[PDB]
Amino acid sequence: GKECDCSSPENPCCDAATCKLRPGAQCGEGLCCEQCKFSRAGKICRIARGDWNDDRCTGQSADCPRNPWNG
């Protein structure tokens, strides 16, 4: 389970041997991964098609969380 931070085995930000971050980068790929770094929270990681609420970046997670109405 915890043995890979990037789903790309050709990404330089994550050691392919372990599949995790090789350098001191917080993340190799993700909506909140700016320059392999964790973007800030409250960041529109994604929009919402319809009329509810877009998606705010957590700031501590590489990917982005979702609302209880997006399915």
Side-chain angles (χ1 to χ4, degrees):
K2 305 257 180 309
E3 45 203 7
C4 178
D5 186 276
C6 64
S7 299
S8 258
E10 266 200 36
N11 225 11
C13 219
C14 53
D15 190 85
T18 182
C19 205
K20 306 225 272 102
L21 273 135
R22 149 68 109 110
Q26 257 63 224
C27 146
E29 75 114 334
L31 272 288
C32 236
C33 301
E34 264 166 58
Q35 293 81 52
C36 277
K37 274 170 184 290
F38 278 136
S39 332
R40 289 66 160 132
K43 133 69 141 196
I44 170 69
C45 40
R46 208 200 232 129
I47 196 138
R49 62 209 257 304
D51 252 342
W52 17 67
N53 213 290
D54 314 354
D55 299 294
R56 294 269 188 305
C57 233
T58 7
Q60 291 189 82
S61 288
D63 313 326
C64 156
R66 348 197 237 66
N67 64 292
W69 321 306
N70 255 338

